[model samples]
Target: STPVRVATLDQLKPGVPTAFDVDGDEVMVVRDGDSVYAISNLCSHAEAYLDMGVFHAESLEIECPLHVGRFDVRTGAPTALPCVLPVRAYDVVVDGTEILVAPK
Candidate 1:
């Protein structure tokens, strides 16, 4: 897997979801305090865009806007109904102002 630079950390506000096409992969980037998370934008259950849904910063999860399914942002584990498979959660690196994600 190659490291793909998604965006600057400043562009991704805290508790906000940002979507990017990293090497043709739809990746979601989120800032959680001093750390950043990179996850697949697609929901494993219904192929929905996770970034278009509600983000739960308190639980570190994102709800699928299409089916209300939720996944853990840190591990991409399914945490709600309509979803049984886990999404792809990539590792992120914060280098100064830039954000990089390791593609799956």
Candidate 2:
């Protein structure tokens, strides 16, 4: 797997969800304090973008604005109704101002 470039760390604000690239494949990046999480942008239960919705910093959960389905950002575990399978999560590296997403 090749190293994939995502958005910069500065571009990602705490408690906000945004879609990035994993070798051009869309992925979600959520900031939580000193750590940033890399997760799949699409919801497993439905075709939803997690980045467009709200993110829970405490639990690192990204909620689906459409049907209220939620997922743990850290583990990519589905946390609500309509979703039983967890989404895929990738690796992230914060190097100074740049953010790198490991290839899947």
Candidate 3:
């Protein structure tokens, strides 16, 4: 929605995650190798932080610990069962050392 604010590029480190507040919503940003993506930090199956859980960069997915839901960060697509809902995502841009997500 409106390409709301996300986080800096450094926050989404390789094999790591960073959560940001965008108009009160928490979003997860991930960096896999050189590819960076943004998605909802909360799991669709359960209210767990996908950003806090493990990330499979090659798979482009994150597993929800509470319900084991799998979602693709790039497209915010749900891959695993039990959670058929899609998560939210935002647009991000890397400008030099600063990252600017759409202002909410």
Candidate 4:
């Protein structure tokens, strides 16, 4: 699979989850400090978008907007209640200022 160019580095704010469509999949691109993470935008627990929720940069988790379920952005593992299933985590590659994401 080829990485799709999503957004530039400057478009993302630290600790904020930004939504982008990568390879026809809704993905959330997050910038946590010097690292960038790409995860599924849909919540595993319910019908909600992860980008609509809050991101905890220190904990490396993104909380679901509907159920408040948290998922680790790095691994897409469920870290809180109501979210036992893991979401897809995409591979990210930064080429200079461009952000590329490969759907997983």
Candidate 5:
């Protein structure tokens, strides 16, 4: 499917991780000012929910609570140990007040 509406910008707060079910795909959404990012909510290494972990809005990074794995929110690159493979990262666009996510 193409990019679709996941949630409103108002529903997601800055520095917070919100999970969205987009056609069976678990997507984690984060908002940093006017920028929004979408990525797989599950950790690539242990398949843990990344939304339940800590999110740093400043660096646009999420730390997995299961094994302390870190990832860049924008690039989905594994930035820490225990997670060598990078997770799926989606393109997020803000259309008015709605957030559109294009899942890979």
Candidate 6:
């Protein structure tokens, strides 16, 4: 699938999980320095929005708001328990200040 523009660099703050709609899917974007990661907004453990959770910059993980499960922002792999399933990770393309994302 082709990447679609989701947001601008200035719109995201470092270590923050920002939610965006990409091709009808809810995706959460996190900015770490010059790199940006895109992951599914929903938590694998429960029906909760990852964007409402806490983003750990040092660990590169986002804690699920509902069950406190954590997932690696880059791979969407569950890092903390209660969440054995992995969420979907997306490919990000940074063009100047524009943020584009596509399903991986």
Question: Which candidate ranks first by lDDT, i.e. highest?
Answer: 6
Clashing pairs in 1: none
lDDT per residue, candidate 3, 1-104, as tens digits? 45544555565568787788867878887777766777888888867888777788778888777777789888889988776999986777666645556643
lDDT scores of the candidates, listed in order? 0.88, 0.82, 0.75, 0.91, 0.89, 0.91
- Lowest lDDT block of 10, candidate 1: 1-10
Candidate 2 lDDT over 15-102, as tens digits, reads: 7778876776789888888688988888888888889888878777888878889988888888888778999888888887788888
Best by TM-score: 4
Order the numbered candidates by lDDT, best leading.
6, 4, 5, 1, 2, 3
**Each prediction's RMSD to truth:** 1.3, 1.4, 2.6, 1.0, 1.3, 1.2
- Cα error, residue 59 of model 4, in Å, equals 0.3
TM-score of each candidate? 0.93, 0.90, 0.83, 0.95, 0.93, 0.95
Give candidate 2 misplaced runs (Cα > 4 Å).
none
Tell me model 2's lDDT, rounded to 2 decimals.
0.82
Q: What shift in Å separates residue 26 of candidate 6 from its native position after superposition?
A: 0.4
Q: Which window of ten consecutive residues has the lowest lDDT sum in model 6?
A: 1-10
Give the per-residue lDDT digits (tens) of candidate 5, residues 9-103. Answer: 98888889989987789999998887898889999998699999999876788999899899999988999998899998988889999999886
Clashes of each: 0, 0, 0, 0, 0, 0
Error of 2 at 21 (Å): 2.3
* TM-score between model 6 and native: 0.95
Task: lDDT winner between 1 and 4, please give it.
Answer: 4
